[PDB]
Design a protein around this ligand. Structure first.
Ligand SMILES: [Zn+2]
Ligand SMILES: [Zn+2]
Lengths: 8, 264, 266
């Protein structure tokens, strides 16, 4: 799954 | 160039509008990013996380209670509406218009946009931590214990509510703890939603990025897909647009001003 | 009364609210109204064109003027007041609480914010009246008719469309085929007795009245707010007219409606 803000 | 944009808009038949928090900001909604964006002693980054919730729901719920209450005085700006109206106006003629939004304040819903994708979920939706149910909730206060808590001042004492008295699952066969049905830092987006969006974008023949830019999350997950098919993309935001290297359709300045002319 | 939270406790208690809107609210949405000092249309102000004679004597021209006004709404959105109202009306109704708008405006902006129990007392731009048989239907067609298509340009210089009357909008119930006019009140035209009776009823029922983007002391707000205030029902003004210290009613709330009102009604 896609993190919010790509992890940041 | 404006009238260039207008002739795609004329021709175009499946439009997909991505909204950032620029539009929310234009309605007076706070958004807790950088320059002066704190709540009491913390920025969003501290509170909008699963651990913060595990570790202090009283506090997290205060934060979120406050955000729910502020919407009571905060109305949809002219963009929110031009969209809603354009969606409706176009649909009449069998023309498709969908909103894809990083915002969670239901302001599109209130302007009356219908085919909408809330990709961060919503403030006015609740998820039971026990059974997992997702129901809408616009109660003010969401529960007695929070009644007029969540005040935004650095100094404010913490409501310090016992967890049993935070909002709970009304299906009392469970009575689990509810959380805001919102995507937090370090949580994945709903694959179901992205598939639907991915479909929707692939169908689109004109894309609008509004109150944000193509180059940053979340727009940047999508704009490529559509741009890569040669579909024109148009930004409407406050980001400045350097000399010499102006994009094919940047529309600098507040959405509320820029957009309704564009969409009429 | 400057004081906010005082007002809020009537609002809490109150069960039939009646909100009167002036053109202040329309102005706050960018809507032009052609009286104000610099606001002409080609060679004339509203006063010249918004009359029965002007219509009898040059419908081509009047219809141009009105065609243009209809089209400008296409870019002009409801401001936060228009909505707070609509939302408050809806939110209150849920709890069996009554909310009605009484409005001097003719731009359907309340309708578009989604207010329902509304009284357009000057009629509306987007309603048509047959001169022959008298029929009243809504009309949002753009253009209202082919002959006016992209006419009505506002520049002093602009040539007149000069349309022959048979090609101006007509009664499509061809049992008649009369000429249509805008279903609006013009200068020197009295208000619909039907509507006033309904309003008179509505006001008599109300236990809180709001005057918005106008003031109690001037026509036509002054036909209403006094009647109800005089029975001790509280009246609250929300406007940008200074209306000097003595002319403010119970609660004044000076400054733009869009700012002032949503806090008040939430
Ligand atoms: Zn549950
Ligand atoms: Zn007729």
């Amino acid at each position: 799954x896609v993190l919010x803000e790509y992890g940041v | 160039d404006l009238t260039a944009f207008r002739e795609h808009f004329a021709k175009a038949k499946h439009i997909a509008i991505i909204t950032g928090a620029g539009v929310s900001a234009e309605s007076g909604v706070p958004t807790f990013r950088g320059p002066g964006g704190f709540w009491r002693k913390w920025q969003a980054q501290d509170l909008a996380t699963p651990e913060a919730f595990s570790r202090d729901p009283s506090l997290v719920w205060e934060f979120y209670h406050y955000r729910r209450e502020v919407m009571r005085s905060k109305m949809p700006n002219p963009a929110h509406l031009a969209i809603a109206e354009c969606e409706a106006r176009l649909g009449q003629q069998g023309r498709s218009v969908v909103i894809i939004t990083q915002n969670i304040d239901e302001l599109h819903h209130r302007a009356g946009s219908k085919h909408v994708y809330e990709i961060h979920g919503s403030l006015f939706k609740t998820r039971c931590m026990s059974c997992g149910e997702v129901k809408a909730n616009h109660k003010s206060p969401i529960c007695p214990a929070l009644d007029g808590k969540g005040a935004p001042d650095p100094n404010t004492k913490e409501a310090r509510i016992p967890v049993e008295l935070l909002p709970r699952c009304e299906r009392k066969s469970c009575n689990g703890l509810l959380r805001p049905h919102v995507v937090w830092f370090g949580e994945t987006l709903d694959s179901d939603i992205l598939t639907a969006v991915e479909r929707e974008l692939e169908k689109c023949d004109l894309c609008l990025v509004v109150g944000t830019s193509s180059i940053v999350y979340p727009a940047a997950m999508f704009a490529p897909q559509v741009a890569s098919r040669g579909v024109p993309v148009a930004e409407f935001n406050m980001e400045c647009t350097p000399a010499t290297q102006r994009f094919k359709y940047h529309f600098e300045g507040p959405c509320g001003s820029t957009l309704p002319p564009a969409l009429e």
